[PDB]
C-alpha cells in the first residue's frame with residue numbers, strides 16, 4: 001500500500017489528462033478507490049467501486065467539487081437528492097424520453113445531420129470534430145433544450161469553456177486552485193448563457209408556450225409556482241456542458257475505434273444495422289464522461305485504504321470501470337463483436353444520464369449519413385489523432401480523407 005501511495009504522489013493532472021490509461025490500469029489493480037493529491041480528490045477506478053458508490057444513495061450523495069460550484073453553480077442536478085433531484089428530473093427528463101423525441105429524429109435530427117454533411121461533401125477531407133460531429137451534437141441537442149437561437153459556434157464555445165472549467169482541477173495540498181485563470185472561459189460563457197436564458201425565462205415564466213424551457217419552468221409545478229432561474233440555471237449548465245459535448249465525443253470515439261478494426265469498419269459502413277452495437281462499444285472503449293461523474297460521502301466510509309469523509313469529491317472513473325479487466329476481455333481494444341455486457345458510460349442508479357436514450361439516436365443518425373455518403377472514409381495518415389482528458393475524454397481532431 002505504501003508503494004501505491006508513493007507513486008500517487010508523483011501523478012500530475014497533466015499526466016492524467018494526457019496518458020490516463022496506464023494510471024487507471026494500476027489503480028484498478030492496487031487501489032480501487034484512491035486519493036489523487038494533484039486533484040485534491042478521490043477517484044474510483046474499478047467497476048465495482050464505481051457502481052457501488054454511484055448506486056449507494058444511503059452512504060453517498062450526488063457529487064460536486066469547487067470546479068462544479070464555480071462553473072455550474074452550487075445546487076445542480078448532479079449533486080441533488082431527494083425531492084429536489086426528483087423535481088429537477090421532472091423538469092429535464094420528459095423531452096428526452098423516446099415517446100417525446102421519436103418524431104424529431106426524422107423531422108429534425110436527420111435534416112440537421114445532412115446539412116452539415118452537405119457542407120463537407122466534395123472536399124475529400126475534413127476535420128470531423130469541428131466540421132461534423134460537434135456542430136451536429138450541439139445543434140441536435142441545443143435545439144431541444146431551449147437554445148435553437150444560439151448558433152453552433154457559440155454552443156461549441158460554451159461547452160468547451162465549461163468543460164475546461166470542470167477539468168481545471170489542479171489544487172495544492174490545502175485544496176487551493178493553482179490555475180484560477182483557467183476559469184476565465186467558463187466565467188465568460190456563464191455570463192453569455194445567463195444573458196440568453198434570463199429573458200427567455202422571464203418571458204416564459206409569465207407566458208408559457210410549450211417549448212422546452214417553458215416545460216422546465218412549469219412542468220410538475222403549481223400554477224403560480226414555476227421554477228425560478230436560480231433553481232434551474234446550474235442544471236441547465238450541466239446540460240449545456242455534457243448534453244452538447246458528449247454526443248459528439250460518442251460519435252468521435254466510435255469512429256476512431258472502428259478505424260482501429262478495418263474489417264469491422266468496413267462491415268459497419270455497409271450494414272448500418274450494426275451502428276447501435278458499434279456506438280455502445282465506442283462508449284465503453286472511450287467513455288466520454290471518463291471520470292467527471294462524482295459522488296460525495298454522506299458519512300465517513302472506508303473502501304480499502306481510502307477513508308472518505310463528507311465534503312470530499314469522489315470522482316467515478318466510469319471510463320476505467322469500462323476498461324476493467326475483471327469485467328471485459330481485452331478491454332483496451334475496440335471490438336464491435338465484444339461479448340455482451342452493460343457499461344457505465346451513462347452512469348447507473350438514480351443519477352443515470354437523463355439523455356441516455358436520446359444521445360445514441362443522434363449519434364446513430366450522424367454516423368449513418370457519414371458512412372452512406374463516404375464509404376471510403378479513413379483517417380488522414382498525414383495527421384495524428386490527439387486524444388485528451390481524464391475527466392471528459394475524447395478526440396480533439398479527426399482529420400479524414402475519402403474518395
Ligand code: HEM
Nearest residue numbers: 077078243246247250289293346347348351353354355359
Ligand atoms: C453519449 C452522450 C452522453 C454521455 C456519455 C453522458 C454521460 C452522463 C453521465 C456519466 C452522467 C452522470 C451519471 C452519474 O453521475 O452516475 C450524466 C448525467 C446527466 N446527463 Fe448525460 N451524457 C450524454 C448525453 C446527454 C444528453 C444529450 C443530455 C441532455 C440533452 C444529458 C443529460 C444529462 C443529465 C440531465 C444528467 C444528470 C442526471 C442526474 O444527475 O440525475 N446527457 N450523463
Ligand SMILES: COc1cccc(OC)c1O
Nearest residue numbers: 166238241242243292293
Ligand atoms: C461535471 O459536469 C458533468 C458531469 C457529468 C455529466 C454532465 O453533463 C451531462 C456534466 O455537465
Ligand SMILES: [Mg+2]
Nearest residue numbers: 037038172173
Ligand atoms: Mg501537489
